Design a protein around this ligand. Structure first.
Ligand SMILES: *[C@@H]1O[C@H](CO)[C@@H](O[C@@H]2O[C@H](CO)[C@@H](O)[C@H](O)[C@H]2NC(C)=O)[C@H](O)[C@H]1NC(C)=O
Ligand SMILES: [Mg+2]
Ligand SMILES: [Mg+2]
Length: 242
C-alpha cells in the first residue's frame, strides 16, 4: 500500500538533516529523473562501509542507480564515526527517523522497501533485516557479517547475500553465517551452495524456500570489493522481483 506522501509536492534531492532523539544526522535523498508523485516507488537504502561516507554510496548505489530507471527513490544515510556500530539500536532508530520522514513526503510503496550495503553497510543491512523485518521487503549484504548487531532476528525476510571467496577482511564464512540465519527463518530446504574457483565466474544458488521469502547466495572469486559487474544487476533483479 502507498504512503501518505503520495500526491504531495516533492522536496528537492540532496543532503537532508534529521533529528534522531536529539542527535542531528544526515542522509542523501535522490529522487528519480522523472518523479511521479502519484506512483508508489521502491525505497532503496544504500549503506556505506567503514571510513567511507554517504558521499561514496551516492550517486551509483552499488550499481542500482544505472538500472532502476524511475522505479526507485534512493537514500544514502551517513554513519556516525564513518561506520554502523548501531550501539543500542541507535542506527536502526536513525533509519526509523528517515522512514517516518520520507513516507510523509514521497510516494512510496510500503511493500517495496529495501536495504543493501558493503562490509559495515552489509552488517547494517543485516541489522535491519533482524530488527525491521516488518519494514523491509528484502536485504542484500555485500561482504556482510554480524558487525552491527542482530536484535530479534527470527522473522523471515527475503535475502540476497554476495561474498568473495578471497576476502581477507571479512572472510566468506562470516557472510554464510548471515545467510544461514535466513535459510532457517525463511523455511528453506537445505541445499549445497557451491562457490567458484580462482578465475571462475560467480556461482548463484537459489534456495527452495517459502515463495514469499526467497534466499539467494552469490559467491564470487574476488576479495573485499563491491565493484563487480554482476552486483548491481543481481541486486536489482532480486529487489525488483516483488
Ligand atoms: C505495491 O507493491 C505490491 C507488491 O509488489 C504490488 O502488488 C503486486 O502487484 C502485482 C502486479 O500488479 C501482483 O502480481 C502481485 O501479486 C502483487 N503482490 C502483492 C503482495 O499485492 C502493488 O500493486 C504495488 N502498488 C500498490 C499501490 O500497492
Ligand atoms: Mg567496513
Ligand atoms: Mg522506469
Amino acid at each position: 500500500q502507498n504512503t501518505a506522501g503520495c500526491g504531495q509536492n516533492p522536496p528537492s534531492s540532496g543532503v537532508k538533516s534529521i533529528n534522531v532523539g536529539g542527535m542531528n544526522r544526515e542522509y542523501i535523498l535522490q529522487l528519480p529523473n522523472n518523479y511521479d508523485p502519484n506512483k508508489g516507488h521502491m525505497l532503496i537504502f544504500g549503506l556505506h562501509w567503514l571510513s567511507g561516507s554517504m558521499h561514496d554510496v551516492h550517486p551509483n548505489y552499488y550499481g542500482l542507480r544505472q538500472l532502476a530507471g524511475n522505479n526507485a527513490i534512493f537514500i544514502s544515510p551517513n554513519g556516525i564515526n564513518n561506520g554502523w556500530a548501531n550501539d543500542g539500536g541507535r542506527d536502526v532508530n536513525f533509519i526509523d527517523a528517515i522512514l517516518q520522514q520520507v513516507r510523509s513526503q514521497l510516494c512510496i510503496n510500503d511493500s517495496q522497501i529495501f536495504a543493501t550495503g558493503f562490509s559495515f553497510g552489509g552488517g547494517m543491512s543485516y541489522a535491519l533485516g533482524c530488527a525491521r523485518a516488518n519494514v523491509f521487503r528484502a536485504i542484500a549484504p555485500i561482504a556482510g557479517a554480524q558487525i552491527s548487531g542482530c536484535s530479534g532476528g527470527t522473522s523471515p525476510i527475503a535475502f540476497l547475500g554476495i561474498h568473495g571467496t578471497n576476502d581477507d577482511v571479512l572472510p566468506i564464512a562470516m557472510g554464510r553465517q548471515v545467510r544461514d540465519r535466513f535459510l532457517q527463518n525463511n523455511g528453506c530446504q537445505p541445499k549445497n551452495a557451491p562457490e567458484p574457483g580462482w578465475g571462475q565466474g560467480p556461482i548463484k544458488t537459489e534456495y527452495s524456500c517459502q515463495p514469499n521469502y526467497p534466499v539467494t547466495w552469490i559467491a564470487f572469486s574476488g576479495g573485499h570489493d563491491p565493484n563487480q559487474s554482476f552486483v548491481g544487476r543481481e541486486i536489482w533483479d532480486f529487489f525488483s522481483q516483488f
